[PDB]
């Protein structure tokens, strides 16, 4: 049969242009701030009385943190063409449209930030250093530097509250002050701090991810004391999370917290559950005195309701026939090589036959989680006619401490068992008849690995924006990411050499296809020239698409139809084979 | 915002559209046509409007059939994608019934004529020609190159050969005796050859400057111009004859081609034909019937005087209205000589509105008024298309052709150039867009290093990158073509690849990850250098890598207008 390449095109572009929208806060007069994918691009928008009011000209990448009512947002923009080098842009509410660019700022990666309305505190990583910064009236000021990868979770008065990764692969908490400035560091011996919000105490309230369970705790700056918090409702202590998505404490004194398990969240106000929707849910604002948070689940893409009805203030409308192209999602319990259960969510393609042909889509991270959430990728797949596996490996998160830290010091290792797992149980349950591995970013280094390390396993393999060398990758890596790939390798270069899929190369045995942004900070392009060098020495047959001007963060339209047409088409043409 | 879709929808079109070739006349005053599509092809009967189908699996080609001979001679790949062939054998009164000529082996079928009484056909496995009949197969003479059968006439049989010394030959033959009589035209070389109800052989004589239509007396090789009735063929003073044959009643019919168009003569008598290209000739119930090709127009088959297309391919009115008239002009060049350009004009896009300048490959090829699934694809998406014959083209003259040799991308790409300022000068473009395949690709990067600002982008396929690294990573063949094309000083000042610090607008690459002719090795060393200098570029390097298929488009052509629409933003 030959491939439907139009209607892939125009499923895959219709999958991209359906809006999906992020929850920031409330600024204004009660005015939604909100972040969107509409019209084509990722915009800033106030939402208020049913209507929307773009705030910013020129596609950004996000906005910080604002507190409640004030006056301004400010947009975070790359400015180097997908290279990840950002600025800060300054927009009165009153005036949208209408930017500002903060100047005293340099072109650097923005990690985080939180907007008081008189201070803007964020975090940055420069090729030498990971820092906080406050810009004020008094300038720009460096707070303190930090460890490696920091970000912004909470201002109130004079103190700051953030969390790191400082080592082995653990989260800390830290606080520093407007005022004075410094840090402090909170590492806890039970496992990672998840979630941070100020109490109206001057307490730093935190989500605490141990082995495999998750609790709130409260920590005192001063001391460094560590005491489990007790809620006026049992629901969220019943609820038993093995993951905290994101916490903080409402206007009016109520302390939102937002849990997840089994990938799948719940809203809690005051420990009690509040309905929401079935799936993902983000952070919870307090909006005209109601509740609104964000939702997503593998059918629905990011939008805004409100809570508890669950009814959809910005939602983007997918058409019948794309909707019915996913015929269902489920979680099943793979079962690897050393006895782990491997939780896995199946994406079952309405326009495939049982047993039938089957992607198994790594997600990157490896810090990163494969929920109920919407996956474009995931539903261009099954738009295709392929199902998708979608395996939370070792080292992903919502799991608990003990599965995410087992991947620190074992890439291409463990968490390669449990993708191998997956993929043999697709074939074996019945639901495969071949199959096929998709990824990227560490997902696509994930593809190498299982190309070079299993070859056989899978018909045909699809790298996105990899990892091919940790050596030149980190020799090509700044303050921050040189940090994260010592913690990931556990500091061994021998490591570093053996798990990299530029080393193993003769092995590969499948037909390959590249993808990688031209001018990406991330995954630099220069190893990757190296990869398809050695492919060519060894007459291996791969094709290779190289796309401008994009980076890791894909703003446009267009970018995104460029680095996920390549994969289907080539998955089509695999398929016919 | 860029309709992807729309784009790779009116693709597939032009790739589906079903072309038409004559083959002749057959059985009871039936059409033989030849339909291709996606790389498909299929012989028909057409008579009355509905077309019959006469091969069940598709076919490569058939043989020519003498007029009103009951059968036709299908040509099939014995395997897939192979280049020997078999013979089938369908009456036209039975289509459909396919039977083997099982005392032909399978070989590769080069050429044929089937007279309704002997098959006679050129094959190679040794070449020869050979005569199949009732009593079997034989082999009447063994060819010193490639050679064609171009008619039979009683016993004669004449033909064309590549023979050795660059020109084509004229041969004869005996369907009796066999045995093999070459005439070689000196300077000149023979393009089409029909057997005079005389027993002479009428053929066209391509030379230098213009072509010739002369008669060859068989018996001693004695070449003479041969003078027509009517003076509009000899007036229109062609530069090839792309057919010529004679008639069932004796007259003689010619097509003869000048500046990229074709005109239809009988008896030397012009016959009113649409603008573009024609094949041959046939009289059909008393109406003159062609094929006729154009930049605006896939091959279709048509009555003349009217133009009427009896039988062509279906296209949708949007993507019809897209595709827009072809013209030709002359753009004055840097040196004083004009370059004849051919520009097909886009229904989508204003006037000024981006014009891509679509370079051709060889570079001893034509760009004339016939039907391009490239350029048709660029206007379907917006783009005026600007396809200049600069020096080294073939198909004006043997001065025009050899003017390229030793000057690789320099005088020729002044003529380049100066057609995309002409497409300035004159009002067509708004913006100015490069694109080329092969040869095309290496003056697509050539120019933009040694033109910056000039074009906004630029596509570049199957390109070279470095002449000095392609003449010893080359065979003899194409390294000896590398001489002849560029000392080894012009070698490294024309190879793009030391000019990267001069390129300044984004760069599209499409290149084969494996073929031998165009090597990926030194594409990937200009990729690094792209990058090593901060230059935007796009690459798409693809394994086995001519659109034929919808399949292949994707593969070359989708990326390279995938690019310049998100280009034009
Ligand atoms: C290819 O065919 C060549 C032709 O018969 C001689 O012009």
Redesign the interface.
Known sequence: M??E??RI??DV?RLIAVEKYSLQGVVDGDKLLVVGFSE?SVNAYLYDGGETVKLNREPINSVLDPHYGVGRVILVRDVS?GAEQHALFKVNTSRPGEEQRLEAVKPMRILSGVDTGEAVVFTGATEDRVALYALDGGGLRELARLPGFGFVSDIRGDLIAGLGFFGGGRVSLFTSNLSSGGLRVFDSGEGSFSSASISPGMKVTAGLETAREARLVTVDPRDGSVEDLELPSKDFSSYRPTAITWLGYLPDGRLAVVARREGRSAVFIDGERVEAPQGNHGRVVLWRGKLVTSHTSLSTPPRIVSLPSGEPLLEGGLPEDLRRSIAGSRLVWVESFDGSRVPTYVLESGRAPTPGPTVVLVHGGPFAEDSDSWDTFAASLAAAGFHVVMPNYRGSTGYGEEWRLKIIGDPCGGELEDVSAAARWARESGLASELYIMGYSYGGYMTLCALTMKPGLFKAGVAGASVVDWEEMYELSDAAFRNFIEQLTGGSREIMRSRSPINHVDRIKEPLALIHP?NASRTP??PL?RL??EL?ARGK?????????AGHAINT??DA??IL?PAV?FLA?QRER
Do not use: N, Y
């Open positions: 030959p491939v390449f139009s095109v125009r572009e084509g063409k031209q392009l220069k020239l398809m060098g060519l047959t791969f094709e290779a698409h190289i796309i401008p001007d339209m267009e139809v460029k047409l088409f043409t």
